[PDB]
């Protein structure tokens, strides 16, 4: 089987503005097979009720999804994205950066 390791990006829907509501995005793409664990974190604790797009894929058959929630970025709170896959030996965590 051709297993593919996920490329991960964490970003905000709109340019971050302190105290203003926004959406936290976690885009996992280019992976195979489909089964994948994506969580959004707020100070280490996973955010509850995070939604995700419908399972689609690319021309090279690799899958992609978008996970998201409402979130209000403050300057002190840290946000992250924790992804675990079958190709990953242990979970991968990527931190949010308003300019990345």
């Amino acid at each position: 089987m051709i297993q593919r390791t996920p490329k991960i990006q964490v970003y905000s829907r709109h340019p971050a503005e302190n105290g203003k509501s926004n959406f936290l995005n976690c885009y996992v793409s280019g992976f195979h097979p489909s089964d994948i664990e994506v969580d959004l974190l707020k100070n280490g604790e996973r955010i509850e009720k995070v939604e995700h797009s419908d399972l689609s894929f690319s021309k090279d058959w690799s899958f992609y999804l978008l996970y998201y929630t409402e979130f209000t970025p403050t300057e002190k709170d840290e946000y992250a994205c924790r992804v675990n896959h079958v190709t990953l030996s242990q979970p991968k965590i990527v931190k949010w950066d308003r300019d990345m």
């Binding site: 051709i2 990006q9 970003y11 489909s34 419908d54 689609s56 978008l66 990345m100």
Partner: protein, 274 residues
């Protein structure tokens, strides 16, 4: 130049239960329809506003077709399992994508029909739409059997007909979303990481369609060797984002230019830092 595309994915779950089937439909970069077998509705569902005022008959037909495909691919997972002589404890994946491209005149361009098993190509209709391309010995078993049922001619008629009929109908109904092009909203950021070097970052937000081109130049000469680029990504509102960054020696910041190409711009953009 527009395209319609359907993506289906079947995954066996021995040890958890019957396989899962997911299908999404896209016109260009916009999803407009979905079907999940694990979902409660058991119906084909809308995912775009402009697809909702199709009739109950349409939703009835589409449900029937996608549930049929679903059942069919469940059996295909079994046939593959004995084609490749594999255990029934394994969880396997059978993906199928198909669709058509139409030109600017609203007429046929490309047809697609494609299979993959566990991430590797299985069998694929070739552009000429008259023959198949088997990727191994098992796919050749399938190629010959289909070539004796004139399956490729059946798919021609769909691809050259039904698909382009639907796509164009859809394009007209979602004329105010599919046929408009949002230009990228661009800005530039400065990020000192030293007192000698600094990160310059060129942004492109809120654009549609997704095809974009962000480049960096130093004195007219491209700087693709020192440029960091990220994959184009969904913002979540139907628009896409992208940025390109470069690290510049302090003082040479004005010799750098960020270069943006999109459908929704009359002509390219050249951005300079001030």
């Amino acid at each position: 130049s527009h395209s319609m595309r359907y993506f289906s994915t079947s995954v066996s779950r021995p040890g958890r239960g019957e396989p899962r089937f997911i299908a999404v439909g896209y016109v260009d970069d916009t999803q407009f329809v979905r079907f999940d077998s694990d979902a409660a509705s058991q119906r084909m569902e809308p995912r775009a506003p402009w697809i909702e005022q199709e009739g109950p008959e349409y939703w009835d037909e589409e449900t029937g077709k996608v549930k049929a495909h679903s059942q069919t691919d469940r059996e295909n997972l079994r046939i593959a399992l004995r084609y490749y002589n594999q255990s029934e404890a394994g969880s396997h994946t059978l993906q199928m994508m198909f669709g058509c491209d139409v030109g600017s005149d609203g007429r046929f361009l490309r047809g697609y029909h494609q299979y993959a098993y566990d991430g590797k190509d299985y069998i694929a209709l070739k552009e000429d739409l008259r023959s198949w391309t088997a990727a191994d010995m098992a796919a050749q078993i399938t190629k010959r059997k289909w070539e004796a049922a004139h399956v490729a001619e059946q798919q021609r008629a769909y691809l050259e007909g039904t698909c382009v009929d639907g796509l164009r109908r859809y394009l007209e109904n979602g004329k105010e979303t599919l046929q408009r092009t949002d230009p990228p909203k661009t800005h530039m950021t400065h990020h000192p990481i030293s007192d000698h070097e600094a990160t310059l970052r060129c942004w492109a937000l809120g654009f549609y369609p997704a095809e974009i081109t962000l480049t960096w130049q130093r004195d007219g000469e491209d700087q693709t060797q020192d440029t960091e680029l990220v994959e184009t990504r969904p913002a979540g509102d139907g628009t896409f984002q992208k940025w390109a960054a470069v690290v510049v020696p302090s003082g040479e910041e004005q010799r750098y230019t960020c270069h943006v190409q999109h459908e929704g711009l009359p002509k390219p953009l050249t951005l300079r830092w001030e």
